Amino acid sequence: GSSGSSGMIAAYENSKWEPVKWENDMHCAVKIQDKNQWRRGQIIRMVTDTLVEVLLYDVGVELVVNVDCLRKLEENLKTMGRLSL
């Protein structure tokens, strides 16, 4: 037992939004409101200076969230545990 390693939500949650330019065909993590789980999305198309269209390829749902909830996909989070390129 004793299995529980919160890195994504942990790091993200603890961290705070940051001013970054979102480009097409990019990876990032969006923060849900009604829920407390960080989902990954793909920069589909920038709508406004605050809104951005992303794709939850992870699950398979096309939607658009606010850059205020968006977060840069940290490398560490990408490779949690065993590191190997």
Side-chain angles (χ1 to χ4, degrees):
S2 291
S3 301
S5 186
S6 53
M8 268 150 97
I9 305 89
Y12 286 119
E13 197 80 54
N14 276 12
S15 270
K16 295 77 155 87
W17 178 96
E18 67 206 314
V20 50
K21 181 206 270 189
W22 293 114
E23 297 275 70
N24 206 299
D25 180 67
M26 270 193 65
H27 272 212
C28 61
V30 41
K31 172 181 153 175
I32 310 163
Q33 285 179 267
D34 176 282
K35 306 296 206 190
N36 271 67
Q37 208 290 328
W38 284 81
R39 280 188 190 180
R40 296 189 153 204
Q42 202 164 338
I43 302 300
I44 293 185
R45 88 200 184 191
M46 276 209 76
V47 185
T48 80
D49 313 286
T50 46
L51 302 177
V52 163
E53 209 168 82
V54 281
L55 158 56
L56 309 185
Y57 53 92
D58 199 312
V59 299
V61 166
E62 308 157 34
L63 93 179
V64 51
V65 309
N66 210 45
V67 294
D68 286 81
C69 274
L70 280 179
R71 282 285 300 163
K72 287 277 270 190
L73 205 76
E74 282 279 335
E75 194 167 54
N76 158 239
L77 304 181
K78 201 206 280 295
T79 53
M80 202 62 92
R82 299 164 77 172
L83 55 155
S84 68
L85 270 298

